[PDB]
């Protein structure tokens, strides 16, 4: 994507400089005038350049269109604020339903809130390998590897079997690190 | 790479000239890497895992390969991921919340915001005892400058308390650590459970650590600079404060105190509980004389944090996990409060007191669901992460001292006390005549508000989906014999 | 621990503080402006005399006499020395508030002085740098400087005593079935 | 399913990270397959109150009994106490 | 090097106009920029700590004082350069910064004192270099005569600084009285025991303290500091603090000596509560000196006190320059000029510094905070070795004293920086003259040694551990 | 992997512990004449002035 032009912005200067300070821009609430600050305010939400320009050119440009875009934005949330009035459609309108989207809305929409929902599946899915878990199966494989022919009883039968050796023999090994205790 | 960004810095710098957008982005890619760092993290492990030495004298500037270990250790287990998994959460938020009301000078507040969240997140990753200290002392000048130059009509006085009172505790701190490097000629955290001190010095290291943790969390009786510095802080400042800054102190009581000194700190824990007791119902009777809001809020903290001490010292693992849940739901909470207070209202009336707030229901009935909302889970309404950091924490007080613990049962009714008396006069009444109606809550206001919500009710539900980071940690610091 | 003479120790006191105060009139006479001659030296004192006298009075006295009656030496009889010293001190001003306020702020510091150690310079043989240090050999007692791996399970039980958590002998073992 | 090595405190020597490493996760892992036993005495003796209804205290004496013996020495202690402590001396 | 350069400069400044004067400082600059960089090398002789007695053991020179002599040198280069260079090419700075004809001598003399104090063996070498350094610095106290607090200062200099060399001589007289020797050399542990020299060694311990100011007698230095021309306060508040305090650390005449450590802790508290009242900005820097010496004195009560001092004088000396070239830099924003020697001479005069030059008030906030000592900046790591020195050896009240005049001097070190960024209401929108590109240049480059030299700490330990073990 | 890397984390910090007290003492030890004082002229033995040298002056 490039967009810039120097040509284009060189006169967009001018055409602000007719026009009174973004202050007192709008303080008469004619409407020819209005009109202008309607399609020069309109300007602001009409990108100008992507980034193979600003990557690219030089700073003399790059402090140029920085000017324009700092009066331009001020014209078009003034006349905002004031008239109540979108500085789109050129003359003012007042159809504010819609068309509306604020500077932060696409980062913290797309890549905010999607990488907050990673997280809560990751925490989901990572809580499956959870210790209580592991120490259940370890009690089941040690019973069962100390006591084999509860392998030979049928399924529905094998649970109540292990939980039986469970409650009737101490399987935990604390005692047996604890050498030094005697 | 970091050629190549730094020139993508610059040239964004020259064309929009401001920050802002860069800022947000940056961070937005943190979270993301952090979450990729959690999806690649080993839970069935207690051993640090993304280790990484900077400053080493073989490669002062790059990373160190080298079989000597002079530098500063940096890693992370599951205790330091939770809390660093809560700052890229909160750093973003922190951003959006002061995207409209910073008009002058605005590069360098975002500049000394996003600062200060990437070294409370450097801190978490500290795998020693001077790595740790000295990204505890960086935010000081930080926060200085900011809420000298962007705080309300007080900030002077506030920027020299949360300097001078941070710096008192500190070189307290600092003695221990100097103590702790010249006794041992090591200072990691990776093998300092190894060391047994004589319990004579390890009583006496302790008292260095305990006074730097009694300014930080705080508590009683040293805490009186916290609601001046929250009052008197730009809202990104009190978000960070209250949120993660605190929560640097529990985390200290794991990390630093209890590996090392943990006779010292059997000996200790009456006094401690004596100390969380009057921090608790003190501060929180306390509350119930203030005028202004943002005050208000901020003294809430000291006693959530008084509960949380309880937790962690109680030499329980029900205690130790209701200490890091109810540190993560206030992280959670209490930022949205400072938000409604001190980013909604005081952008909207541009003051705090309570005398000039009645029936705010009538024109913003949303702004007044989300205080309902916020305050229930303030004072820890159930199925809200409040609610089991309490519980928690009050079942491992209870059971290493019941009359102690019973005793601090009470801070149930003293919050909520506190709290209702607050939202009561702020929703309900006629509408005040001192102030003229405004818009209800913005889009930006109420997405910070949601995730906020949203989070403390997820970990409400749930809180088991800890776990999996956690169980080591609520092993690996109680001393039984 | 073998008593301070408090009565004789006190007089050298006495006599000590008297030559400090009479020391600091002089240099105060000689020191500021406007008429002075050799008798008003004590005159325009401002009572300095007084309050070297007061002072080593109170702290020997109080330091011996506390010392004696707890028969220990240790930083608490210069919490003491130091509380009766700020009463001295303290009660210049006439008011009850600053009075207290003396009296509890230079006990604590003097408290603190006395925890150290009660000196100004170092007690160079029980530093660390005189001082066995590292790790103890095969199984010698831990001395206060010096670091083990394992300590006495019967030293703790010993120093922090039994209940909450600290046992005899630990759970496992004990409760094992046979 | 993975099942390390079982290391005790007591044998190894305090300078192999590798083997003090190895020996806590041993420790807490022996807690808590005894947090699961007690669980297990826990859930049979729910199941058989739930059937014996007002002969339960008869049919699950032995139960309740176990579960009340198992209760104060089947939670968590750490390995600290252990390994900082050596209970021969 | 240096003893060439005085003759040279001798005949040269002799036979030189005054409109040469600029020109003949910008050549004894490079002169000695180039002495360090190619005469550096010879730090080979000191590998494994090796020590050699020259001139028939009136000298000494080992890592320490090889060190030391390299520091100074880097002092005066930055010094000189602030004489040789204009901040800017209008009439006003003409007046302002003028060197006289005769200074450069007067600051070569000096600094040749300090070396020799420094590698003095025997106390005739030290006496006639304490002489050599307090003539010249009375000399260079006077030389702006046109000031009447100049003038002032330097007949004070001369009588306080008389005292004490009398003290002093007085001292080494009664050593060799006792002992027929002029060397600490023949002291052994054998001769401590035997005899007592405390009273003799401590008698030219605070006669040499003195002369740097250390409490009670330090209301005459920091009166003298007030009433100099700023350019001459950068040098004679620095350089005899050094060579003073670098000849005791390595003597070690004063180990846990009562008398140093009671004058260390008063030092320490005078220095910390009197400068909080201070509105002149020199008065305020004066008594932040006290304070460091302070600090400095501890390690006169301890063995193995090399690498401590080493760091905290080299970090001290980089942030005092710091602090008056910003300071010198300011000048240029502020609305009312005092006076034609001291240009600024009130702290509120740089209020609202930040609106004016932003830049420079970083500048200021990282110094601020290196003399505070928050880390990772070099006073951090300066305090955090004291510390270690001081509590390996027992001195724990003084730890704590430390701990409390820290904390309190942090408040009129904030000072600065609080007036510095409070708003102004006529701010700076352009101008055509910039600031000079080489006191820029030198300026920056202290401030990124202060907030990045933590980066080399273990590189600079362990070459430590192979020149001073 | 995890344990492996952490051991081998916790020997390189072993390493500079050793290292540091072992520079420690190192310091202390007392050094020869030669190495601490003159390396050329390495006897401390004094012979005064030669003028009048009086035989039976010199003693050991
Ligand atoms: C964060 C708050 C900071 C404030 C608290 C600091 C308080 C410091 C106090 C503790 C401490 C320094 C510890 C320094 C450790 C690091 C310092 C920490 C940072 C310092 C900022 C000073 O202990 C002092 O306590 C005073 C009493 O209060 C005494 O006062 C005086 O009492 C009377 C004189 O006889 C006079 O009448 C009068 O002169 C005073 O009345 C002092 O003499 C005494 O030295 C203890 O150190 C010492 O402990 C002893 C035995 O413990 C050690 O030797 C042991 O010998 C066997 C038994 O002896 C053991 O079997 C053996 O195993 C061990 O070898 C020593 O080697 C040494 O190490
Ligand atoms: C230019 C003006 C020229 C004027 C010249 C005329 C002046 C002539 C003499 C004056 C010379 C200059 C005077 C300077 C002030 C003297 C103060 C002074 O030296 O510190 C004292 C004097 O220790 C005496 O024992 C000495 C005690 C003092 C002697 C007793 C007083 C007698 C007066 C009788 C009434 C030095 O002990 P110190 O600090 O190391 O203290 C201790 C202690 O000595 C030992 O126990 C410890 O082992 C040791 O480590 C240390 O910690
Ligand atoms: C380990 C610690 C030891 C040493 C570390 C200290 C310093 C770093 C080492 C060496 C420092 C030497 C650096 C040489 C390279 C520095 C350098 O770009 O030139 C100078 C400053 O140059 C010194 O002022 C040279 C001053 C040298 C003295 C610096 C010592 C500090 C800055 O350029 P610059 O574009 O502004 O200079 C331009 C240009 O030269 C003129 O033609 C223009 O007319 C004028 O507008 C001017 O702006
Ligand atoms: C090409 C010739 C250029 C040499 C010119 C040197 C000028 C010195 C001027 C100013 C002093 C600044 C500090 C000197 C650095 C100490 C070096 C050393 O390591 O100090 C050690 C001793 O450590 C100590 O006691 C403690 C020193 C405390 C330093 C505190 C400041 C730390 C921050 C500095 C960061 C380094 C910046 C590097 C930028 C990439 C002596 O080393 P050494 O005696 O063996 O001599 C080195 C070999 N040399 C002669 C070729 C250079
Ligand atoms: C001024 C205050 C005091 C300043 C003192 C400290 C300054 C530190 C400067 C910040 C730089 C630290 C962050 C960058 C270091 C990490 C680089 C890295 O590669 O980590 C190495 C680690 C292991 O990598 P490796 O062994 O090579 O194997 C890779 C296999 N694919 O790979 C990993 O496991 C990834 C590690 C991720 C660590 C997360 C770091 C989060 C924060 C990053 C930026 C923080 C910037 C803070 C700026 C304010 C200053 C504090
Ligand atoms: C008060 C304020 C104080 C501020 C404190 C900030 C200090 C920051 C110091 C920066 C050093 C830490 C850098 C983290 C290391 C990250 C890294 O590895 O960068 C890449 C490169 C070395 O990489 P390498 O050693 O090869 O290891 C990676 C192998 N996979 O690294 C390099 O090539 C060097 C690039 C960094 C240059 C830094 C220059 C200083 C800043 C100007
Ligand atoms: C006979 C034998 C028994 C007597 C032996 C006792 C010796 C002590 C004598 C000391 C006399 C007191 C000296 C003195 O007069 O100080 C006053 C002098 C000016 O004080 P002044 O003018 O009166 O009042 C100003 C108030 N804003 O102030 C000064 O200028 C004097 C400076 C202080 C004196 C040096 C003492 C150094 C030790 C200070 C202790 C620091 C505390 C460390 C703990
Ligand atoms: C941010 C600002 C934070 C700063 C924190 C406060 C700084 C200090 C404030 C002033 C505290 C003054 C303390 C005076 C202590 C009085 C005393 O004499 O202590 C001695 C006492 C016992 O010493 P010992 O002789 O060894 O007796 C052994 C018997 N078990 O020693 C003790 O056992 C300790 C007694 C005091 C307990 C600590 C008090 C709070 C610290
Ligand atoms: C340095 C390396 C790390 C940099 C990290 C961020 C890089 C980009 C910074 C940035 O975005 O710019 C910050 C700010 C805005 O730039 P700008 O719009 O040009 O300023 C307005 C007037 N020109 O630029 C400025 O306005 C500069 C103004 C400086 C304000 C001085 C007061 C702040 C002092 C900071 C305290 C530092 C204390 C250090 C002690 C340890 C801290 C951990």
């Known amino acids: 994507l490039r967009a810039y032009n120097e040509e284009k912005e060189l006169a967009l200067k001018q055409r602000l400089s007719q026009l009174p300070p973004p202050g007192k821009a709008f303080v008469t609430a004619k409407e020819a005038e209005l009109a202008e600050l309607a399609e020069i305010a309109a300007l602001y939400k009409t990108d100008r350049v992507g980034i193979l320009d600003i990557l690219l050119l030089g700073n003399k440009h790059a402090r140029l269109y920085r000017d324009n875009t700092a009066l331009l934005k001020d014209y078009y949330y003034n006349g905002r604020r004031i008239l109540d009035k979108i500085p789109v459609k050129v003359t003012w309108e ?89 | 790479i970091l050629l190549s960004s730094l020139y993508l810095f610059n040239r964004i710098l020259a064309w929009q000239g401001n920050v802002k957008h860069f800022y947000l982005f940056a961070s937005n890619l943190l979270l993301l890497f952090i979450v990729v760092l959690y999806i690649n993290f080993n839970t069935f492990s207690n051993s640090f895992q993304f280790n990484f030495e900077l400053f080493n004298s073989l490669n002062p500037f790059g990373l160190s390969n080298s079989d000597i270990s002079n530098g500063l250790l940096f890693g992370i287990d599951g205790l330091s991921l939770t809390f660093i998994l809560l700052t890229v959460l909160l750093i973003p938020l922190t951003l959006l919340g002061n995207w409209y009301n910073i008009n002058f000078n605005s590069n360098l507040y975002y500049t000394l915001v996003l600062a200060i969240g990437l070294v409370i997140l450097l801190n978490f990753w500290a795998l020693d005892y001077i790595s740790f200290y000295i990204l505890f002392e960086a935010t000081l000048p930080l926060l200085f400058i900011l809420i000298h130059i962007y705080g309300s009509s007080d900030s002077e006085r506030a920027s020299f308390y949360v300097l001078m009172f941070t710096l008192s505790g500190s070189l307290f701190m600092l003695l221990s650590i100097v103590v702790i490097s010249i006794v041992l000629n090591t200072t990691n955290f990776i093998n300092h459970n190894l060391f047994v001190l004589s319990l004579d010095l390890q009583t ?137 207070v001190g980013g909604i209202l005081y952008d909207r009336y541009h003051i705090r007191i309570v005398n000039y707030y009645k029936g705010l229901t009538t024109y913003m009935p949303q702004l007044a669901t989300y205080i309902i909302i916020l305050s229930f889970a303030n004072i820890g309404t159930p199925l809200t992460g409040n609610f089991t950091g309490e519980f928690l924490s009050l079942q491992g007080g209870f059971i290493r001292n019941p009359i102690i613990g019973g005793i601090s049962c009470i801070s149930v009714l003293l919050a909520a006390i506190y709290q209702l008396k607050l939202t009561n006069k702020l929703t309900g009444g006629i509408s005040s005549i001192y102030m003229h109606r405004t818009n209800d809550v913005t889009i930006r206001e109420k997405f910070i508000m949601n995730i906020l919500i949203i989070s403390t009710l997820i970990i409400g539900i749930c809180p088991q989906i800890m776990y999996n980071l956690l169980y080591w940690t609520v092993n690996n610091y109680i001393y039984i014999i | 621990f073998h008593p301070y003479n408090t009565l004789g120790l006190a007089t050298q006191s006495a006599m000590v503080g008297l030559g400090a105060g009479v020391v600091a009139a002089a240099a105060r006479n000689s020191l500021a402006t406007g008429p002075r001659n050799i008798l008003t030296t004590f005159s325009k004192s401002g009572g300095v005399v007084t309050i070297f006298t007061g002072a080593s009075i109170a702290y020997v006295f109080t330091y011996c006499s506390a010392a004696n009656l707890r028969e220990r030496k240790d930083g608490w009889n210069h919490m003491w020395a130091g509380a009766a010293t700020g009463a001295v001190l303290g009660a210049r001003t006439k008011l009850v508030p600053a009075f207290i306020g003396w009296t509890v702020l230079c006990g604590a510091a003097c408290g603190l002085f006395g925890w150290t150690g009660a000196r100004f310079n170092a007690d160079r043989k029980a530093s660390l740098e005189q001082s066995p240090k590292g790790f103890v050999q095969e199984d010698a007692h831990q001395t206060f400087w010096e670091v083990v791996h394992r300590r006495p399970l019967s030293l703790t039980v010993e120093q922090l005593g039994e209940g909450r958590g600290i046992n005899a002998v630990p759970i496992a073992t004990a409760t094992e079935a046979p | 399913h993975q099942r390390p090595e079982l290391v005790s405190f007591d044998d190894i020597n305090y300078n192999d990270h590798k083997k003090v490493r190895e020996a806590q996760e041993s420790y807490t892992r022996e807690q808590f397959i005894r947090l699961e036993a007690l669980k297990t005495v826990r859930k049979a003796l729910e199941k058989c109150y739930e059937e014996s209804g007002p002969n339960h205290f008869e049919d699950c004496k032995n139960l309740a009994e176990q579960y009340l013996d198992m209760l104060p020495t089947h939670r968590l202690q750490g390995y600290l106490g252990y390994q900082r402590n050596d209970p021969s001396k | ?168 001589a007085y001292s080494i007289n009664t050593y060799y009285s006792v002992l027929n020797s002029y060397t600490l050399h023949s002291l052994d542990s054998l001769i401590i025991n035997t005899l007592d020299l405390n009273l003799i060694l401590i008698a030219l311990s605070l006669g040499l303290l003195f002369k740097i100011g250390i409490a009670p007698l330090h209301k005459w230095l920091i009166s003298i500091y007030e009433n100099t021309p700023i350019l001459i306060t950068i040098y004679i508040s620095l350089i005899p603090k050094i060579s003073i305090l670098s000849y005791l650390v390595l003597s070690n005449i004063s180990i846990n000596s009562l008398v140093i450590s009671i004058l260390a802790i008063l030092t320490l508290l005078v220095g910390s509560v009197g400068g909080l009242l201070q509105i002149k900005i020199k008065r305020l820097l004066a008594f932040s000196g006290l304070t460091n010496a302070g600090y400095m004195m501890l390690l006169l009560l301890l063995n193995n006190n090399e690498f401590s001092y080493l760091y905290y004088i080299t970090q001290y000396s980089i942030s005092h320059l710091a602090i008056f070239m910003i300071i010198i830099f300011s000048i240029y924003y502020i609305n009312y000029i005092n006076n034609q020697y001291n240009p600024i001479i009130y702290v509120n005069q740089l209020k609202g510094l930040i609106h004016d030059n932003a830049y420079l008030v970083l500048s200021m906030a990282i110094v601020v905070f290196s003399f505070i000592g928050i880390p990772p900046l070099l006073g951090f790591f300066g305090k955090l070795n004291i510390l270690m020195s001081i509590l390996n050896n027992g001195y724990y009240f003084i730890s704590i004293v430390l701990i409390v005049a820290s904390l309190i001097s942090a408040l009129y070190y904030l000072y600065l920086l609080n007036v510095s960024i409070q708003d102004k209401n006529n701010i700076l929108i352009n101008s055509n003259e910039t600031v000079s590109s080489v006191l820029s240049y030198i300026l920056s480059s202290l401030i990124i040694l202060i907030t990045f030299g933590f980066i080399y700490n273990s590189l600079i330990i362990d070459i430590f551990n192979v020149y001073f073990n | 992997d995890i344990l492996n890397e952490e051991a081998k984390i916790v020997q390189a910090l072993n390493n500079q512990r050793e290292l540091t007290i072992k520079m420690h003492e190192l310091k202390r030890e007392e050094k020869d004449y030669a190495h601490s004082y003159s390396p050329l002229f390495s006897d401390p033995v004094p012979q005064g002035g030669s003028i009048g040298k009086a035989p039976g002056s010199s003693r050991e």
Not at chain 1, 158 to 179: F, N, P, T
Not at chain 2, 218 to 239: N, Q, Y
Not at chain 2, 308 to 335: E, Q
């Open chain 1, 94 to 182: 007042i159809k504010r339903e819609g068309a509306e989207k604020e500077d932060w809305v696409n980062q913290m929409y797309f890549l905010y809130a999607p990488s907050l929902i990673l997280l809560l599946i990751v925490m989901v899915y990572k809580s499956r390998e959870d210790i209580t878990f592991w120490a259940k199966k370890e009690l089941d494989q040690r019973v069962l590897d100390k006591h084999p022919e509860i392998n030979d009883a049928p399924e529905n039968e094998r649970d109540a079997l292990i939980v039986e050796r469970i409650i009737a023999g101490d399987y935990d090994k604390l005692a047996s690190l604890q050498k030094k205790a005697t």
């Open chain 2, 204 to 340: 006496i290291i302790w008292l260095g650590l305990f006074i730097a943790i009694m300014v930080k969390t705080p508590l009683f009786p040293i805490h009186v600079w916290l609601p001046v510095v929250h009052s008197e802080s730009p809202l990104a400042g009190s978000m960070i404060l209250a949120g993660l800054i605190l929560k640097l102190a529990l985390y200290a009581i794991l990390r630093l105190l209890l590996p090392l000194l943990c006779e010292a700190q059997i000996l200790y824990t009456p006094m401690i509980y004596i100390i969380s007791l009057l921090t608790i119902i003190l501060t929180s009777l306390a509350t119930l004389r203030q005028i202004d809001l943002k005050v208000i809020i901020a003294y809430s903290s000291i006693s959530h944090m008084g509960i949380a001490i309880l937790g962690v010292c109680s030499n329980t693992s029900l205690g130790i996990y209701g200490s890091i849940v109810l540190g993560v739901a206030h992280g959670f909470v209490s930022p949205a409060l400072f938000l409604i």
């Open chain 5, 1 to 168: 090097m240096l003893i060439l350069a005085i003759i040279s400069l001798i005949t040269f400044v002799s036979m030189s106009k005054l409109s040469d004067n600029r020109a003949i400082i910008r050549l004894i600059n490079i002169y000695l920029i180039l002495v360090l960089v190619l005469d550096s090398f010879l730090y080979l002789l000191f590998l494994n700590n090796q020590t050699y007695t020259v001139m028939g053991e009136l000298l000494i020179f080992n890592s320490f004082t090889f060190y030391i002599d390299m520091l100074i040198y880097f002092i005066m280069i930055v010094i000189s350069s602030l004489y040789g260079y204009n901040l800017y090419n209008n009439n006003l700075y003409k007046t302002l910064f003028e060197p006289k004809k005769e200074l450069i001598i007067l600051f070569l003399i000096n600094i040749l004192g300090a070396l020799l104090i420094v590698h003095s063996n025997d106390f005739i070498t030290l006496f006639v270099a304490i002489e050599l350094q307090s003539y010249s610095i009375y000399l260079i106290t006077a030389i702006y005569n046109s000031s009447y607090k100049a003038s002032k200062a330097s007949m004070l200099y001369f009588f306080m600084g008389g005292i004490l060399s009398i003290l002093i």
